[PDB]
N, CA, C and O atoms as a Tinker XYZ file with bonds, in Angstrom:
   380  protein
     1  N    146.084000   10.303000 -119.660000    73     2
     2  CA   146.146000    9.468000 -118.948000    64     1     3
     3  C    145.463000    9.542000 -117.613000    63     2     4     5
     4  O    146.027000    8.908000 -116.721000    81     3
     5  N    144.342000   10.198000 -117.284000    73     3     6
     6  CA   143.652000   10.013000 -115.693000    64     5     7
     7  C    142.514000    8.543000 -116.047000    63     6     8     9
     8  O    142.081000    8.096000 -117.109000    81     7
     9  N    142.348000    8.169000 -114.774000    73     7    10
    10  CA   141.280000    7.231000 -114.968000    64     9    11
    11  C    141.100000    7.472000 -113.368000    63    10    12    13
    12  O    141.892000    7.995000 -112.584000    81    11
    13  N    139.835000    6.936000 -113.135000    73    11    14
    14  CA   139.145000    7.212000 -111.718000    64    13    15
    15  C    139.030000    5.748000 -111.283000    63    14    16    17
    16  O    138.530000    4.902000 -112.024000    81    15
    17  N    139.449000    5.502000 -110.204000    73    15    18
    18  CA   139.536000    3.966000 -109.297000    64    17    19
    19  C    138.459000    4.012000 -108.313000    63    18    20    21
    20  O    138.654000    4.678000 -107.296000    81    19
    21  N    137.347000    3.397000 -108.469000    73    19    22
    22  CA   136.371000    3.124000 -107.404000    64    21    23
    23  C    136.726000    2.349000 -106.542000    63    22    24    25
    24  O    137.179000    1.381000 -107.152000    81    23
    25  N    136.815000    2.144000 -105.294000    73    23    26
    26  CA   137.253000    1.060000 -104.674000    64    25    27
    27  C    136.012000    0.458000 -104.119000    63    26    28    29
    28  O    135.371000    1.361000 -103.582000    81    27
    29  N    135.387000   -0.712000 -104.017000    73    27    30
    30  CA   134.540000   -1.308000 -103.575000    64    29    31
    31  C    134.262000   -2.492000 -102.680000    63    30    32    33
    32  O    135.241000   -3.229000 -102.568000    81    31
    33  N    133.219000   -2.861000 -102.033000    73    31    34
    34  CA   133.290000   -4.302000 -100.830000    64    33    35
    35  C    131.804000   -4.701000 -101.154000    63    34    36    37
    36  O    130.968000   -3.873000 -101.516000    81    35
    37  N    131.552000   -6.021000 -100.994000    73    35    38
    38  CA   129.941000   -6.452000 -100.690000    64    37    39
    39  C    129.474000   -6.011000  -99.577000    63    38    40    41
    40  O    130.018000   -6.134000  -98.479000    81    39
    41  N    128.119000   -5.310000  -99.883000    73    39    42
    42  CA   127.126000   -5.011000  -98.518000    64    41    43
    43  C    127.478000   -3.505000  -98.739000    63    42    44    45
    44  O    127.015000   -2.967000  -97.733000    81    43
    45  N    128.065000   -2.506000  -99.537000    73    43    46
    46  CA   128.265000   -1.029000  -99.416000    64    45    47
    47  C    127.391000   -0.499000  -99.837000    63    46    48    49
    48  O    127.253000   -0.428000 -101.058000    81    47
    49  N    126.470000    0.076000  -98.950000    73    47    50
    50  CA   125.204000    0.825000  -99.384000    64    49    51
    51  C    125.504000    1.975000 -100.284000    63    50    52    53
    52  O    124.896000    2.174000 -101.336000    81    51
    53  N    126.810000    2.989000  -99.662000    73    51    54
    54  CA   127.194000    3.979000 -100.321000    64    53    55
    55  C    127.873000    4.114000 -101.668000    63    54    56    57
    56  O    127.873000    5.167000 -102.305000    81    55
    57  N    128.469000    2.960000 -102.079000    73    55    58
    58  CA   128.434000    2.022000 -103.074000    64    57    59
    59  C    127.680000    2.158000 -103.988000    63    58    60    61
    60  O    127.842000    2.921000 -104.941000    81    59
    61  N    126.649000    1.334000 -103.772000    73    59    62
    62  CA   125.183000    1.034000 -104.139000    64    61    63
    63  C    124.754000    2.496000 -104.762000    63    62    64    65
    64  O    124.531000    2.834000 -105.925000    81    63
    65  N    124.736000    2.985000 -103.933000    73    63    66
    66  CA   124.024000    4.971000 -104.116000    64    65    67
    67  C    124.771000    5.206000 -105.105000    63    66    68    69
    68  O    124.128000    5.559000 -106.094000    81    67
    69  N    126.186000    5.142000 -105.288000    73    67    70
    70  CA   126.872000    5.934000 -106.269000    64    69    71
    71  C    126.046000    5.158000 -107.216000    63    70    72    73
    72  O    125.112000    5.775000 -107.728000    81    71
    73  N    126.252000    3.631000 -107.625000    73    71    74
    74  CA   126.274000    2.793000 -109.039000    64    73    75
    75  C    124.778000    3.612000 -109.569000    63    74    76    77
    76  O    124.580000    3.808000 -110.768000    81    75
    77  N    123.942000    3.978000 -108.668000    73    75    78
    78  CA   122.338000    3.984000 -109.069000    64    77    79
    79  C    122.395000    5.259000 -109.329000    63    78    80    81
    80  O    121.655000    5.419000 -110.300000    81    79
    81  N    122.892000    6.360000 -108.993000    73    79    82
    82  CA   123.021000    7.804000 -108.963000    64    81    83
    83  C    123.997000    8.561000 -109.757000    63    82    84    85
    84  O    123.652000    9.584000 -110.350000    81    83
    85  N    125.040000    8.170000 -109.792000    73    83    86
    86  CA   126.224000    8.611000 -110.507000    64    85    87
    87  C    126.927000    7.790000 -111.914000    63    86    88    89
    88  O    127.281000    8.369000 -112.941000    81    87
    89  N    127.007000    6.508000 -111.689000    73    87    90
    90  CA   127.475000    5.799000 -112.649000    64    89    91
    91  C    126.695000    5.755000 -113.935000    63    90    92    93
    92  O    127.318000    6.044000 -114.957000    81    91
    93  N    125.507000    5.458000 -114.028000    73    91    94
    94  CA   124.944000    5.718000 -115.184000    64    93    95
    95  C    125.067000    7.207000 -116.322000    63    94    96    97
    96  O    125.089000    7.227000 -117.553000    81    95
    97  N    125.129000    8.320000 -115.351000    73    95    98
    98  CA   125.843000    9.649000 -116.268000    64    97    99
    99  C    127.140000    9.604000 -116.365000    63    98   100   101
   100  O    127.569000   10.129000 -117.393000    81    99
   101  N    128.187000    9.011000 -115.417000    73    99   102
   102  CA   129.274000    9.290000 -115.484000    64   101   103
   103  C    130.080000    9.311000 -116.451000    63   102   104   105
   104  O    130.972000   10.159000 -116.414000    81   103
   105  N    129.978000    8.070000 -117.991000    73   103   106
   106  CA   130.621000    8.319000 -118.750000    64   105   107
   107  C    130.088000    8.978000 -120.002000    63   106   108   109
   108  O    130.623000    8.902000 -121.109000    81   107
   109  N    128.897000    9.682000 -119.688000    73   107   110
   110  CA   128.450000   10.561000 -120.517000    64   109   111
   111  C    128.329000   12.320000 -120.557000    63   110   112   113
   112  O    127.636000   13.112000 -121.195000    81   111
   113  N    129.416000   12.442000 -119.496000    73   111   114
   114  CA   129.611000   13.676000 -119.065000    64   113   115
   115  C    131.211000   14.251000 -119.401000    63   114   116   117
   116  O    132.061000   13.518000 -119.906000    81   115
   117  N    131.377000   15.191000 -119.158000    73   115   118
   118  CA   133.134000   15.589000 -119.740000    64   117   119
   119  C    133.743000   15.357000 -118.714000    63   118   120   121
   120  O    134.904000   15.032000 -118.959000    81   119
   121  N    133.472000   15.374000 -117.543000    73   119   122
   122  CA   134.203000   14.873000 -116.113000    64   121   123
   123  C    134.713000   13.445000 -116.167000    63   122   124   125
   124  O    135.885000   13.108000 -116.000000    81   123
   125  N    133.548000   12.542000 -116.454000    73   123   126
   126  CA   133.487000   11.063000 -116.901000    64   125   127
   127  C    134.345000   10.726000 -117.995000    63   126   128   129
   128  O    134.771000    9.582000 -118.154000    81   127
   129  N    134.581000   11.566000 -118.661000    73   127   130
   130  CA   135.092000   11.225000 -120.240000    64   129   131
   131  C    136.739000   11.416000 -119.855000    63   130   132   133
   132  O    137.612000   10.677000 -120.311000    81   131
   133  N    136.986000   12.509000 -118.961000    73   131   134
   134  CA   138.345000   13.115000 -118.634000    64   133   135
   135  C    139.120000   11.976000 -118.018000    63   134   136   137
   136  O    140.323000   11.737000 -118.126000    81   135
   137  N    138.143000   11.288000 -117.317000    73   135   138
   138  CA   138.677000   10.597000 -116.064000    64   137   139
   139  C    137.714000    8.998000 -116.290000    63   138   140   141
   140  O    136.636000    9.005000 -115.697000    81   139
   141  N    137.969000    8.001000 -116.898000    73   139   142
   142  CA   136.990000    7.331000 -116.905000    64   141   143
   143  C    136.953000    6.151000 -115.754000    63   142   144   145
   144  O    138.086000    5.844000 -115.385000    81   143
   145  N    135.850000    5.401000 -115.087000    73   143   146
   146  CA   136.101000    4.973000 -113.698000    64   145   147
   147  C    136.119000    3.367000 -113.912000    63   146   148   149
   148  O    135.418000    2.609000 -114.581000    81   147
   149  N    137.079000    3.206000 -113.169000    73   147   150
   150  CA   137.062000    1.431000 -113.155000    64   149   151
   151  C    136.929000    1.178000 -111.632000    63   150   152   153
   152  O    137.520000    1.807000 -110.754000    81   151
   153  N    135.973000    0.055000 -111.440000    73   151   154
   154  CA   136.154000   -0.732000 -110.215000    64   153   155
   155  C    136.989000   -1.951000 -109.711000    63   154   156   157
   156  O    137.221000   -2.983000 -110.341000    81   155
   157  N    137.272000   -1.722000 -108.827000    73   155   158
   158  CA   137.881000   -2.714000 -107.724000    64   157   159
   159  C    137.589000   -2.732000 -106.554000    63   158   160   161
   160  O    137.227000   -1.703000 -105.983000    81   159
   161  N    137.693000   -4.055000 -105.861000    73   159   162
   162  CA   137.560000   -4.126000 -104.660000    64   161   163
   163  C    138.448000   -3.944000 -103.530000    63   162   164   165
   164  O    139.554000   -4.485000 -103.545000    81   163
   165  N    138.040000   -3.175000 -102.472000    73   163   166
   166  CA   139.086000   -3.148000 -101.775000    64   165   167
   167  C    139.964000   -3.872000 -101.440000    63   166   168   169
   168  O    141.163000   -3.598000 -101.387000    81   167
   169  N    139.365000   -5.017000 -101.144000    73   167   170
   170  CA   140.364000   -6.453000 -100.249000    64   169   171
   171  C    141.561000   -7.075000 -101.159000    63   170   172   173
   172  O    142.669000   -7.499000 -100.828000    81   171
   173  N    140.853000   -6.962000 -102.582000    73   171   174
   174  CA   142.028000   -7.566000 -103.521000    64   173   175
   175  C    143.569000   -7.033000 -103.650000    63   174   176   177
   176  O    144.087000   -5.938000 -103.430000    81   175
   177  N    143.974000   -8.048000 -104.016000    73   175   178
   178  CA   145.346000   -7.121000 -104.390000    64   177   179
   179  C    145.528000   -6.156000 -105.621000    63   178   180   181
   180  O    144.731000   -6.478000 -106.503000    81   179
   181  N    146.236000   -5.180000 -105.945000    73   179   182
   182  CA   146.052000   -4.279000 -106.819000    64   181   183
   183  C    146.550000   -4.479000 -108.011000    63   182   184   185
   184  O    147.579000   -5.149000 -108.110000    81   183
   185  N    145.792000   -3.829000 -109.395000    73   183   186
   186  CA   146.189000   -4.099000 -110.717000    64   185   187
   187  C    147.950000   -3.732000 -110.592000    63   186   188   189
   188  O    148.434000   -2.680000 -110.177000    81   187
   189  N    148.651000   -4.888000 -111.064000    73   187   190
   190  CA   150.197000   -4.705000 -111.323000    64   189   191
   191  C    150.233000   -3.430000 -112.109000    63   190   192   193
   192  O    149.703000   -3.204000 -113.197000    81   191
   193  N    151.205000   -2.365000 -111.096000    73   191   194
   194  CA   151.853000   -1.383000 -112.044000    64   193   195
   195  C    151.443000    0.090000 -111.148000    63   194   196   197
   196  O    152.108000    1.119000 -111.024000    81   195
   197  N    150.069000   -0.265000 -110.588000    73   195   198
   198  CA   149.407000    0.768000 -110.123000    64   197   199
   199  C    149.995000    1.250000 -108.758000    63   198   200   201
   200  O    150.005000    0.446000 -107.825000    81   199
   201  N    150.499000    2.544000 -108.579000    73   199   202
   202  CA   151.178000    3.300000 -107.232000    64   201   203
   203  C    149.997000    3.598000 -106.676000    63   202   204   205
   204  O    149.191000    4.128000 -107.440000    81   203
   205  N    149.554000    3.360000 -105.244000    73   203   206
   206  CA   148.540000    4.484000 -104.243000    64   205   207
   207  C    149.486000    5.140000 -103.450000    63   206   208   209
   208  O    150.551000    4.555000 -103.255000    81   207
   209  N    149.308000    6.222000 -102.965000    73   207   210
   210  CA   149.536000    7.237000 -101.809000    64   209   211
   211  C    149.632000    6.178000 -100.514000    63   210   212   213
   212  O    150.650000    5.585000 -100.157000    81   211
   213  N    148.513000    6.109000 -100.001000    73   211   214
   214  CA   148.517000    5.065000  -99.069000    64   213   215
   215  C    147.300000    4.330000  -99.189000    63   214   216   217
   216  O    146.547000    4.691000 -100.093000    81   215
   217  N    146.819000    3.018000  -98.197000    73   215   218
   218  CA   145.967000    2.170000  -98.662000    64   217   219
   219  C    144.761000    2.326000  -98.463000    63   218   220   221
   220  O    144.394000    2.877000  -97.425000    81   219
   221  N    143.788000    1.851000  -99.470000    73   219   222
   222  CA   142.470000    2.055000  -99.111000    64   221   223
   223  C    141.687000    1.191000  -98.029000    63   222   224   225
   224  O    141.684000   -0.004000  -97.732000    81   223
   225  N    140.956000    2.442000  -97.525000    73   223   226
   226  CA   140.071000    2.022000  -96.020000    64   225   227
   227  C    139.269000    2.193000  -95.781000    63   226   228   229
   228  O    138.899000    2.084000  -94.612000    81   227
   229  N    138.289000    2.674000  -97.028000    73   227   230
   230  CA   137.211000    3.178000  -96.649000    64   229   231
   231  C    136.641000    2.786000  -97.951000    63   230   232   233
   232  O    137.327000    2.856000  -98.971000    81   231
   233  N    135.202000    2.305000  -97.969000    73   231   234
   234  CA   134.106000    2.550000  -99.500000    64   233   235
   235  C    133.225000    2.808000  -99.082000    63   234   236   237
   236  O    132.655000    2.584000  -98.015000    81   235
   237  N    132.950000    3.564000 -100.326000    73   235   238
   238  CA   133.304000    3.993000 -101.738000    64   237   239
   239  C    134.823000    4.969000 -101.305000    63   238   240   241
   240  O    134.910000    5.593000 -100.247000    81   239
   241  N    135.640000    4.935000 -102.085000    73   239   242
   242  CA   137.168000    5.526000 -102.150000    64   241   243
   243  C    137.098000    5.736000 -103.633000    63   242   244   245
   244  O    136.673000    4.810000 -104.324000    81   243
   245  N    137.512000    6.980000 -104.250000    73   243   246
   246  CA   137.750000    7.346000 -105.907000    64   245   247
   247  C    139.179000    7.949000 -105.614000    63   246   248   249
   248  O    139.538000    8.658000 -104.674000    81   247
   249  N    139.844000    7.493000 -106.624000    73   247   250
   250  CA   141.287000    7.608000 -106.482000    64   249   251
   251  C    141.173000    7.859000 -107.937000    63   250   252   253
   252  O    140.718000    7.120000 -108.811000    81   251
   253  N    141.680000    9.058000 -108.023000    73   251   254
   254  CA   142.380000    9.756000 -109.175000    64   253   255
   255  C    143.753000    9.185000 -109.663000    63   254   256   257
   256  O    144.640000    9.221000 -108.810000    81   255
   257  N    143.986000    8.822000 -110.516000    73   255   258
   258  CA   145.312000    8.092000 -111.142000    64   257   259
   259  C    146.010000    9.207000 -112.064000    63   258   260   261
   260  O    145.231000    9.647000 -112.910000    81   259
   261  N    147.083000    9.673000 -112.092000    73   259   262
   262  CA   147.573000    9.870000 -113.301000    64   261   263
   263  C    148.491000    8.896000 -113.405000    63   262   264   265
   264  O    149.292000    8.477000 -112.570000    81   263
   265  N    148.193000    8.420000 -115.074000    73   263   266
   266  CA   149.273000    7.342000 -114.919000    64   265   267
   267  C    149.050000    6.226000 -114.401000    63   266   268   269
   268  O    147.924000    5.776000 -114.187000    81   267
   269  N    150.070000    5.691000 -114.158000    73   267   270
   270  CA   149.851000    4.508000 -112.839000    64   269   271
   271  C    150.081000    5.435000 -111.327000    63   270   272   273
   272  O    149.813000    4.957000 -110.224000    81   271
   273  N    150.426000    6.321000 -111.459000    73   271   274
   274  CA   150.431000    7.017000 -110.085000    64   273   275
   275  C    148.928000    7.675000 -109.060000    63   274   276   277
   276  O    148.393000    8.715000 -109.444000    81   275
   277  N    148.614000    7.247000 -108.321000    73   275   278
   278  CA   147.582000    8.250000 -107.480000    64   277   279
   279  C    148.155000    9.821000 -107.820000    63   278   280   281
   280  O    149.333000   10.135000 -107.988000    81   279
   281  N    146.927000   10.735000 -107.869000    73   279   282
   282  CA   147.260000   12.183000 -107.625000    64   281   283
   283  C    146.541000   12.629000 -106.951000    63   282   284   285
   284  O    146.807000   13.793000 -106.652000    81   283
   285  N    145.266000   12.033000 -106.327000    73   283   286
   286  CA   144.370000   12.847000 -105.499000    64   285   287
   287  C    143.079000   11.604000 -105.367000    63   286   288   289
   288  O    142.606000   10.822000 -106.192000    81   287
   289  N    142.801000   11.864000 -103.919000    73   287   290
   290  CA   141.500000   10.767000 -103.627000    64   289   291
   291  C    140.192000   11.417000 -103.298000    63   290   292   293
   292  O    140.279000   12.639000 -103.177000    81   291
   293  N    139.136000   10.961000 -103.142000    73   291   294
   294  CA   137.792000   11.441000 -102.570000    64   293   295
   295  C    137.575000   10.177000 -101.860000    63   294   296   297
   296  O    137.651000    9.052000 -102.354000    81   295
   297  N    137.246000   10.539000 -100.424000    73   295   298
   298  CA   136.826000    9.298000  -99.775000    64   297   299
   299  C    135.379000    9.398000  -99.337000    63   298   300   301
   300  O    135.152000   10.198000  -98.429000    81   299
   301  N    134.500000    8.802000  -99.776000    73   299   302
   302  CA   132.911000    8.420000  -99.509000    64   301   303
   303  C    132.448000    9.345000 -100.554000    63   302   304   305
   304  O    133.056000   10.088000 -101.324000    81   303
   305  N    130.633000    8.977000 -100.280000    73   303   306
   306  CA   129.693000    9.615000 -101.171000    64   305   307
   307  C    128.776000   10.189000 -100.470000    63   306   308   309
   308  O    127.850000    9.491000 -100.058000    81   307
   309  N    128.812000   11.512000 -100.184000    73   307   310
   310  CA   127.949000   12.208000  -99.377000    64   309   311
   311  C    126.664000   12.769000 -100.232000    63   310   312   313
   312  O    125.763000   13.511000  -99.843000    81   311
   313  N    126.890000   12.119000 -101.645000    73   311   314
   314  CA   125.692000   12.800000 -102.608000    64   313   315
   315  C    126.175000   13.448000 -103.876000    63   314   316   317
   316  O    127.299000   13.950000 -103.893000    81   315
   317  N    125.466000   13.468000 -104.849000    73   315   318
   318  CA   125.867000   13.795000 -106.026000    64   317   319
   319  C    126.761000   15.380000 -106.299000    63   318   320   321
   320  O    127.750000   15.562000 -107.009000    81   319
   321  N    125.967000   16.421000 -105.420000    73   319   322
   322  CA   126.262000   17.848000 -105.443000    64   321   323
   323  C    127.744000   17.724000 -104.715000    63   322   324   325
   324  O    128.614000   18.590000 -104.814000    81   323
   325  N    127.861000   16.628000 -104.050000    73   323   326
   326  CA   129.146000   16.738000 -103.523000    64   325   327
   327  C    130.507000   15.951000 -104.196000    63   326   328   329
   328  O    131.638000   16.429000 -104.110000    81   327
   329  N    130.218000   14.751000 -104.833000    73   327   330
   330  CA   131.128000   14.178000 -105.621000    64   329   331
   331  C    131.588000   14.932000 -107.201000    63   330   332   333
   332  O    132.660000   14.591000 -107.699000    81   331
   333  N    130.831000   15.809000 -107.815000    73   331   334
   334  CA   131.299000   16.605000 -108.702000    64   333   335
   335  C    132.164000   17.526000 -108.824000    63   334   336   337
   336  O    132.996000   17.729000 -109.707000    81   335
   337  N    131.869000   18.196000 -107.680000    73   335   338
   338  CA   132.952000   19.662000 -107.866000    64   337   339
   339  C    134.310000   18.883000 -106.758000    63   338   340   341
   340  O    135.386000   19.482000 -106.771000    81   339
   341  N    134.241000   18.021000 -106.154000    73   339   342
   342  CA   135.352000   17.530000 -105.347000    64   341   343
   343  C    136.154000   16.698000 -106.761000    63   342   344   345
   344  O    137.205000   17.098000 -107.263000    81   343
   345  N    135.629000   15.874000 -107.076000    73   343   346
   346  CA   136.477000   15.360000 -108.461000    64   345   347
   347  C    136.926000   16.235000 -109.298000    63   346   348   349
   348  O    138.007000   15.987000 -109.833000    81   347
   349  N    136.103000   17.695000 -109.691000    73   347   350
   350  CA   136.313000   18.259000 -110.664000    64   349   351
   351  C    138.118000   19.233000 -109.908000    63   350   352   353
   352  O    139.161000   19.439000 -110.527000    81   351
   353  N    137.819000   19.543000 -108.635000    73   351   354
   354  CA   139.175000   19.846000 -107.863000    64   353   355
   355  C    140.426000   18.772000 -108.171000    63   354   356   357
   356  O    141.497000   19.249000 -108.546000    81   355
   357  N    140.313000   17.565000 -108.038000    73   355   358
   358  CA   141.271000   16.540000 -108.264000    64   357   359
   359  C    141.535000   16.496000 -109.677000    63   358   360   361
   360  O    142.735000   16.403000 -109.932000    81   359
   361  N    140.568000   16.546000 -110.920000    73   359   362
   362  CA   141.279000   16.388000 -112.203000    64   361   363
   363  C    142.125000   18.104000 -112.342000    63   362   364   365
   364  O    143.266000   18.142000 -112.804000    81   363
   365  N    141.427000   19.400000 -111.899000    73   363   366
   366  CA   142.330000   20.474000 -111.836000    64   365   367
   367  C    143.703000   20.397000 -111.227000    63   366   368   369
   368  O    144.688000   21.061000 -111.548000    81   367
   369  N    143.629000   19.719000 -110.539000    73   367   370
   370  CA   145.096000   19.595000 -109.814000    64   369   371
   371  C    146.030000   18.710000 -110.338000    63   370   372   373
   372  O    147.242000   18.919000 -110.283000    81   371
   373  N    145.302000   17.311000 -111.060000    73   371   374
   374  CA   146.259000   16.442000 -111.808000    64   373   375
   375  C    146.873000   17.296000 -112.910000    63   374   376   377
   376  O    148.016000   17.122000 -113.334000    81   375
   377  N    145.886000   18.393000 -113.418000    73   375   378
   378  CA   146.689000   19.426000 -114.754000    64   377   379
   379  C    147.128000   20.553000 -114.618000    63   378   380
   380  O    147.637000   21.137000 -115.575000    81   379
């Protein structure tokens, strides 16, 4: 019941970097398969039933959901080598 919500907005260069660098590999990796990604726009209303710990104020933000509730989040994308182990900490903490 893990999912990774990725919050984006128009003109976000760091979203576009993640989309080019991580997104293609993501569903093909163990991590990606453990927490499938779903993109949303920061300024839209949330999909119904989804409970966040606090508003999304930065893009990209990646929120790890356990069922319908935020377990943890990563804000920003400083590069591939930052993304993977930080996401792994979140996945570990959700179980």
